[PDB]
Amino acid sequence: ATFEIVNRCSYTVWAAASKGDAALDAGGRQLNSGESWTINVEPGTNGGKIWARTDCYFDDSGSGICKTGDCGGLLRCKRFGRPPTTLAEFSLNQYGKDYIDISNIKGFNVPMNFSPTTRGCRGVRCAADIVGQCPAKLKAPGGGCNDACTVFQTSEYCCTTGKCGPTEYSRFFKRLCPDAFSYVLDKPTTVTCPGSSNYRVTFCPTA
């Protein structure tokens, strides 16, 4: 499957693409404002994620740091990024279907549109100003809005027992982005696409 990753932000982001134990394609790249990066994701890829990283410094070897979504100091992510990270999440060719979503479960750094570029389903978007509205206790100093699980490390926020409810904090994410997961047991906003759909992830779709 092809993913076009477009940075419509006025600021540089460092795109990342990982399935948690491995890079997707190159796994990361600098996107200046307006730049597009096309990656190939193996069919059957399960638990793929795409995210943006902000305020990165990388040396000549691809080692450094981001203020959001840092994946162990690498330009080319092999691992998932450090919250806060707005997540494009996908499982491809799962019994003839693709499953896509946006998640705020790991917080929010950069607004995002996650849309198919092929026919047969709709995109999802989380483009509200979650950083601007972020409750005081979830504000990440580096930039972004942490989920409550990252900040407080409770069973209720992290849903550790597999039993938990919405929270004041999950409802803030859900109110600003109803089409994204706000907590682990949120009513699914997963979209079902045809197997082997192609996609565009757009950072700062509107701004």
DSSP alpha helix (H) spans, 56-198: 130-133, 148-152, 155-158, 168-176
Give rounded-to-5 percent helix, strand, coil for the chain.
Answer: 10, 35, 50
User: CATH topology for 1-207?
Assistant: Thaumatin (2.60.110)
Q: Experimental method used, please?
A: X-ray
The tokens of 104 are what? 């705020």
Q: Is 109 exposed, middle or buried (0-12, 13-18, 19+ CB in 10 A)?
A: buried
Q: Which of 71, 90, 89 is nearest to 80 (CA)?
A: 71
Are the CB atoms for 194 and 98 separated by under 8 Å? Answer: yes
- The phi-psi region of residue 168 (left if phi > 0; otherwise alpha if psi is between -120 and 50; otherwise beta) is alpha
Residues ≥6 apart with Cβ < 8 Å to 170: 147, 148, 157, 182, 183, 186
Cα–Cα dist 51/16, whole Å: 5
For the range 24-27, what are the long-range contacts, defined as Cβ-Cβ under 8 Å and sequence gap of 24 or more? 24/48, 24/50, 26/76, 27/71, 27/74, 27/76, 27/77, 27/78
Are the CB atoms for 51 and 141 separated by under 8 Å? Answer: no
Domain ranges (residues) in the chain: 1-207
Q: If DSSP codes are grouped into helix, strand and coil, which group holds residue 77?
A: coil
Q: Which of 41, 11, 187 is nearest to 111 (CA)?
A: 11
| CA-based end-to-end distance of the chain | 27
Cα–Cα dist 72/115, whole Å: 28
Burial pattern 119-137, b for ≥16 Cβ within 10 A else e, equals: eebebbbbbbebbeebeee
How many C-beta atoms lie closer than 10 Å to residue 168's C-beta? Answer: 9
Q: What is the resolution of this structure in A?
A: 2.3
Are the CB atoms for 139 and 172 separated by under 8 Å? Answer: no
Q: If DSSP codes are grouped into helix, strand and coil, which group holds residue 152?
A: helix
DSSP alpha helix (H) spans, the chain: 130-133, 148-152, 155-158, 168-176
Cα–Cα dist 3/142, whole Å: 28
